[model samples]
Target: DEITITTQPKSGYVIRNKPLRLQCRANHATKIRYKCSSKWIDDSRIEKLIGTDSTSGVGYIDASVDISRIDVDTSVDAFQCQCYASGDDDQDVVASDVATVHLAYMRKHFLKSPVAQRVQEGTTLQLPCQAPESDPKAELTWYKDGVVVQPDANVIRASDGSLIMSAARLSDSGNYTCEATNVANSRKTDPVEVQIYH
Candidate 1:
């Protein structure tokens, strides 16, 4: 009995909240059966089978998992998929490579912080933005009252991925949003209300 497993995405790539496809090929098998299981690091019951296909003697199984309603906490954790066949229970312990569903761009990222609410009118404010360590360095842009802030010639990308404003004024008190983008995906932080004290 021979079996081969393949996935549309090879490996070592960031995947957002989307459908993931995997296929299994089994050759020279008398009977065929399959089960797919996925769970987060701290999860209990394995998620339901994404897909299952059964055929006799040289067959293929296709599985597609959709992560539509995944929450912020679950998205931060890595998930694994395992495929099992009827015969040869010993060799059925096949596990697909782990994939992480990033929630770095979720609604929580844009919530206004208490510190931002108490900022004084004439003081400078520094906003911070960050992505998962596994993710590539993200590009952060600052928008003041729905307008993008242009960086000066001397200003450079900060280690924390933020734009610093000096001597913020009452005009700066308004809705601010930070956008983080990478080759694979992009996420905008929730609107932060920067209230300035006059």
Candidate 2:
């Protein structure tokens, strides 16, 4: 009388560019159908249906679908999928709990470039860092001449992705860059020259 998802996604969500698989079982169901976000999965996405009928002596049914892979834009791709089971007359329908799908990605390059900067040794300075579009957002890391930048009492790595120093020093001059990483990929921005003159 109820449909249950037996082979659901491990995370209950699908990765945007990864394969997708799901299976469901139902009691006394003659037909089983799958839909995501309230839309029926096209027959093209269905891999197969097992135990199509009770004639096999099994009182339940099974169905599954697979997508070789998926790729899409940066926008949200979370989808709620459910399976419906019904009797031969298509009556007494039962739907399984929703299985969600989420988009995961890290796009290439930043929207804008960090610009070169020149400042007096005693002046406050900031090196801008920006990340491209990504799912779960992207983490930022600042580098100076290919070395990771360490934040100290006088240096602050802002949450908005900028490196800040209250006062500059001659030793602070160097080639600066930033790297961004997410679940899908890691990318970096072009180097920018920063100068601190006495």
Q: Considering every candidate listed, which one attains the maximal TM-score?
A: 2
34-68, model 1: which lDDT tens digit per residue? 22224332222223232334543344444443343
Model number with the top lDDT: 2
Screening candidate 2 with a backbone cut-off below 3 angstroms (N, C-alpha, C), the clashing residue pairs are none
Cα lDDT listed for each candidate: 0.48, 0.71
Model 1 TM-score is 0.45
Give the Å error, residue 169, model 1. Answer: 11
All candidates' TM-scores?
0.45, 0.77
Model 2, 1-198: lDDT tens per residue?
444344433324345466566777776666677776656767666654555443646456667776323422222467666777767664578778777766667777786557898899999998777788887788998889989999997779988898998989888898988888787678888889999888
